[PDB]
Write a protein that binds this ligand. Structure first.
Ligand SMILES: NC(=O)C1=CN([C@@H]2O[C@H](COP(=O)(O)OP(=O)(O)OC[C@H]3O[C@@H](n4cnc5c(N)ncnc54)[C@H](OP(=O)(O)O)[C@@H]3O)[C@@H](O)[C@H]2O)C=CC1
Ligand SMILES: NC(=O)C1=CN([C@@H]2O[C@H](COP(=O)(O)OP(=O)(O)OC[C@H]3O[C@@H](n4cnc5c(N)ncnc54)[C@H](OP(=O)(O)O)[C@@H]3O)[C@@H](O)[C@H]2O)C=CC1
Ligand SMILES: CN(Cc1cnc2nc(N)nc(N)c2n1)c1ccc(C(=O)N[C@@H](CCC(=O)O)C(=O)O)cc1
Ligand SMILES: CN(Cc1cnc2nc(N)nc(N)c2n1)c1ccc(C(=O)N[C@@H](CCC(=O)O)C(=O)O)cc1
Ligand SMILES: Nc1nc2[nH]cc(Cc3ccc(C(=O)N[C@H](CCC(=O)O)C(=O)O)cc3)c2c(=O)[nH]1
Ligand SMILES: Nc1nc2[nH]cc(Cc3ccc(C(=O)N[C@H](CCC(=O)O)C(=O)O)cc3)c2c(=O)[nH]1
Ligand SMILES: O=c1[nH]c(=O)n([C@H]2C[C@H](O)[C@@H](COP(=O)(O)O)O2)cc1F
Ligand SMILES: O=c1[nH]c(=O)n([C@H]2C[C@H](O)[C@@H](COP(=O)(O)O)O2)cc1F
Lengths: 508, 508
């Protein structure tokens, strides 16, 4: 009784693994992953066996792998004993003789194509699966990886990596079996004595029925869980509260999310996020614009709700034009403390150009601690059609010339605003990184009133049922002179294979 | 072979447990803790044995405890078999015949005073310790709890609680024995392939030699660990970087801390924090003052460094008076966007009184999401002697009438500034809570440039060697009409028993 693991690199959707006797891709780090998993052993005087089919044995040049014993499953290969690092068996069942008899073998690994993968799962020989999901689907395949049986459950999902603009994950699947210990009891008993006085009870762990992929307990490395587990945490501890709109929310205070931008782009995969509208809003801010029609003219109606004549007169802005949102994001960025008249006037030169100073400070004094771009100005809050949600952001240049970003958000619509704020400030960091000459780094979002609107409950609960997929890659097609020169055609979204879009109405 | 645990509630320093045949305090929740700990059993048809001395047996009225068998260790009590829930033995060793003979007993608990505690530890009969540390030490004791031997190591430390303004902790100590498994290996191998491309390697777990009380792995509930583990994370991942001063730091980006204020006060115990100077700085901000002499007149020299004539002329403020810090904290609070002349002029009425609007909004509109108090004003940054470190703060009223606080900090001097910012915004939250009529809630601090100055290394490593003690209680002695009426004599610090103060020089 030893371990029998499966190592495979399959496509994210169709689970393709090969085409015309070779791989559909060339990822160097994945092969190194195959090296270390198949070499990882405990006994020095032992070797791991790698089982593969003849067609696969041909694909790897018919040459042995160092420090490993290759087991070829071929119906017509000569069982020659000359090579001690390569042995041939007639069928897969008879080849699993090393478990009980061959004590010189520590672990067993299955990695030999569809015919061996499917036969190893249909006969219940497998104990664990090492799946390398690759974000490639608009190509051709002829050999696929079988559907993972119900007996297996994911226990680990690595962060999204990148090689030649190709995103990929690393997952572990374990087979279900049958059916520190004192610390958990003492914390529970303290939770029974102090009701909500103990802070642990105020932040209860999300229940299994609202935890996204609850089988992955200790291996929640994928940074989309930083958003999906916040949804779960709100569903568990959110207090039903009212607000300025008629749609009440479930709200918790003081939450944070953390995303990687070096090897991926934090665009959610559990729901098709309108990436174009995110950009057009961001470049709208950068340009210094407050005209709400300029987004509607580009078929982006995100600010149409808070920019209706009925809404502005309702909040005391009847003198304002239809979509004159007022000094908001992109007016405190480019013209801070500037006397706001209307959205048609020329504001060139007035105010404090924070973005310009931010860019110039990022390149002249990178290790400066004051790379701050704020939007909360109490003098102009009364003029705003909606006070800023993402109020203040700070930027950081690491020693390896990477640009990280921190953002504080006073109010976070986890249904709609959060998927936008994650991608919006990710693109803004990448934009700042290119103009300043650095690489994208990490993105951390600090949240105050993290909430879910009550009409988003059935929708977001559906989103939590979708096991996430690797983040896509976002690369720019050209280097721009100034930051405002970016256009939608300059962005290339690579490997975005999300779940179907989810409709949720905005609370005006 | 079953488990033998000891349950004790001792004072935090001298470990006193009794005086004149009774307890030195009256904490109801502690007795309820003793109830659930001694009753926690797995078998329905089994009872836990509670061992105690005669003097202790007298202290509890000589009456049995429900669902439990009390074992009295007395040299001259009659071994009466009339009561089946109380049995008497002559010595402690002979009383431990429940391990091998009486299978009707599941667990054994030692809880019978000094004479039984010392004999149970000197003879190595104990397997686990349930310690309830109480923050009372300036009273009299006559019975103490023996010092925990080196064979025991702490594995859990609960959050600081409160009963009648008495702070107390719950800890677990386990005796050392001799000397999921696949997920950790796969993450390690991914760390060998991707160097710093994998985000996990940029946030490596702190090594044991810099982890405060590294024996407490899964039970780091005490929220002083939210600060001590930030020190460890900086020591592990901090990049050596320069700054505006000559003292280089080790800095990491995007960290957060979370403290409880309902049942405790987040004043660090691993170092004697100058609590008075914290208050005088805070009330200085609230009053709207920017005159540095008003703190020096009260023997508070924290802002003396950034207010020397040599420093102001060094940063381009030679025209400024000796300690005229300029529009800083407490001038953007009370007079935001107010044209700052000097520190002697009258600024009453000018600017935007954020604090006044914040107070008025906190009680009139509690579920508002705009309870924000900012200090980052780009128009006046050049006039400031030092840009704001704690830039923006947001406040939140829960459904149970508690006031929580969020704070974003752009730069964090973990040696000096951080212990002050934790207590300063804790006091400010409590002050706002009393004036508005709410109770203190949670305090979350979000940090950008969390760093340690290199001249603080020997000191902070010393601070990490001190296992923390329960937080003290801070209560106000009177209700004030306006928030500015607070005085140092109005604050009462209850149960603060910290480790000796640690001297660290400020980087000017
Ligand atoms: N992405 C990835 O992780 C991997 C991808 N691949 C790719 O998959 C493709 C190859 O897989 P595939 O097409 O399925 O072919 P296989 O690799 O599964 O090899 C099949 C051969 O093995 C022998 N064989 C298989 N099953 C039996 C059996 N039950 N009894 C006796 N002999 C058996 C036969 O050899 P014989 O002719 O002697 O009868 C058969 O032709 C290639 O493109 C390869 O590159 C391969 C491995 C990993
Ligand atoms: N804070 C806490 O968790 C607890 C506090 N306490 C406090 O501690 C105080 C009492 O403890 P303490 O003063 O140490 O007295 P003890 O509770 O330890 O009881 C001592 C008695 O037990 C008997 N005894 C002890 N050792 C032996 C032995 N080796 N052989 C035979 N008999 C023995 C003797 O009884 P005899 O007279 O018959 O010889 C002795 O007088 C009280 O104030 C009590 O409130 C007690 C328990 C818990
Ligand atoms: C059978 N096969 C196809 C193949 C390709 N990619 C995969 N990727 C994964 N995740 N899992 C597999 N089973 C897998 N199999 C192989 C097997 C070994 C090598 C190989 O070259 N291994 C070298 C790797 C060289 C290097 O370090 O990059 C080794 O040392 O083991 C390539 C393809
Ligand atoms: C021996 N002793 C002294 C005493 C007091 N406080 C302690 N506190 C701790 N943490 N540990 C002890 N061993 C301890 N012992 C005792 C024992 C039981 C009760 C007691 O009244 N127990 C009731 C508790 C009643 C209630 O629920 O509040 C029970 O149901 O067990 C009081 C003092
Ligand atoms: N109460 C409230 N006011 C807001 N003002 C501006 C925004 C940002 C915003 C506005 C609209 C959408 C929106 O409806 N977007 C959809 C996609 C919705 C989705 O994520 O499925 C789209 O326009 O394509 C998203 C963010 C916003 C919000 O979320 N909530
Ligand atoms: N570069 C820099 N500038 C600062 N300006 C104001 C502060 C906050 C500050 C300043 C001085 C002290 C200080 O010296 N405090 C000592 C004790 C220091 C301590 O051990 O905590 C005291 O006031 O008694 C503490 C915080 C501060 C800081 O930390 N770093
Ligand atoms: O970028 C945005 N992100 C976001 O989360 N919101 C949502 C948060 C909240 O649901 C609403 C503002 O409501 P309130 O004014 O009460 O904070 O806007 C809006 C944006 F423009
Ligand atoms: O309340 C404070 N908190 C704090 O952390 N600092 C430290 C942080 C940093 O070490 C220094 C400011 O340096 P810089 O202006 O380059 O960010 O002041 C100062 C305060 F007044």
């Amino acid at each position: 009784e030893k371990n029998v693991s499966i190592v495979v690199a399959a496509s994210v959707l169709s689970s393709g693994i090969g085409i015309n006797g070779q791989l559909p891709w060339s990822i160097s780090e994945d092969l190194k992953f195959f090296s270390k998993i198949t070499n990882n052993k405990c006994d020095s005087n032992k070797k791991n066996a790698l089982i593969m089919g003849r067609k696969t044995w041909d694909s790897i040049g018919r040459r042995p792998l160092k420090n490993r014993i290759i087991v070829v499953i071929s119906s017509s290969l000569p069982q020659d004993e000359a090579d001690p690092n390569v042995v041939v068996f007639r069928n897969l069942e008879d080849s699993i003789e090393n478990l009980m008899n061959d004590d010189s073998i520590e672990n067993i690994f299955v990695c030999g194509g569809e015919s061996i993968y499917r036969d190893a799962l249909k006969d219940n020989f497998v104990d664990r699966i090492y799946l390398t999901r690759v974000a490639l689907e608009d190509i051709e395949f002829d050999t696929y990886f079988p559907e993972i049986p119900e007996t297996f459950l994911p226990v680990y999902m690595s962060q999204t990596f990148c090689t030649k603009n190709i995103s990929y994950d690393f997952m572990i699947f374990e087979k279900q079996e049958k059916k520190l210990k004192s610390i958990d009891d003492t914390v529970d008993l303290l939770g029974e004595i102090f009701g909500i006085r103990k802070m642990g009870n105020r932040h209860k762990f999300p229940k299994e029925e609202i935890y996204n992929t609850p089988s992955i307990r200790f291996g929640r490395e994928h940074y989309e869980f930083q958003y999906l587990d916040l949804l779960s945490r709100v569903l568990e501890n959110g207090a039903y509260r009212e607000n300025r709109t008629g749609i009440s929310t479930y709200s918790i205070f003081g939450q944070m999310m953390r995303f990687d931008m070096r090897e991926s782009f934090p665009l959610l995969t559990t729901k098709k996020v309108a990436i174009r509208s995110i950009f057009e809003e961001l470049i709208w801010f950068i340009k210094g614009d407050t005209n709400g029609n300029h987004l509607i003219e580009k078929k982006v109606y995100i600010w149409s709700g808070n920019g209706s004549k009925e809404y502005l007169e309702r909040i005391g802005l009847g003198h304002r034009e239809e979509n004159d949102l007022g000094p908001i994001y992109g007016f405190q960025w480019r013209h801070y403390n500037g006397e706001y008249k209307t959205m048609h006037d020329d504001y060139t030169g007035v105010g404090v150009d924070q973005l310009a100073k931010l860019i110039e400070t990022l390149k002249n004094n990178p290790k400066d601690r004051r790379h701050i771009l704020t939007a909360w100005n109490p003098s102009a809050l009364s003029q705003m059609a909606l006070p800023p949600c993402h109020v203040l952001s700070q930027y950081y240049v690491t020693n390896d010339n990477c640009l990280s970003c921190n953002l504080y958000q006073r109010s976070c619509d986890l249904g709609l605003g959060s998927p936008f704020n994650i991608a919006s400030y990710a693109i803004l960091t990448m934009m700042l990184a290119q103009v300043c000459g650095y690489e994208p780094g990490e993105l951390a979002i600090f949240i105050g009133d993290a909430h879910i609107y009550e009409n988003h409950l059935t929708q977001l609960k559906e989103q939590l049922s979708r096991t996430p997929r690797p983040f896509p890659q976002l690369k720019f097609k050209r280097k721009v002179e100034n930051i405002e020169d970016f256009k939608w055609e300059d962005i290339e979204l690579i490997g975005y294979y999300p779940y179907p879009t989810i409709k949720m109405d905005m609370a005006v």
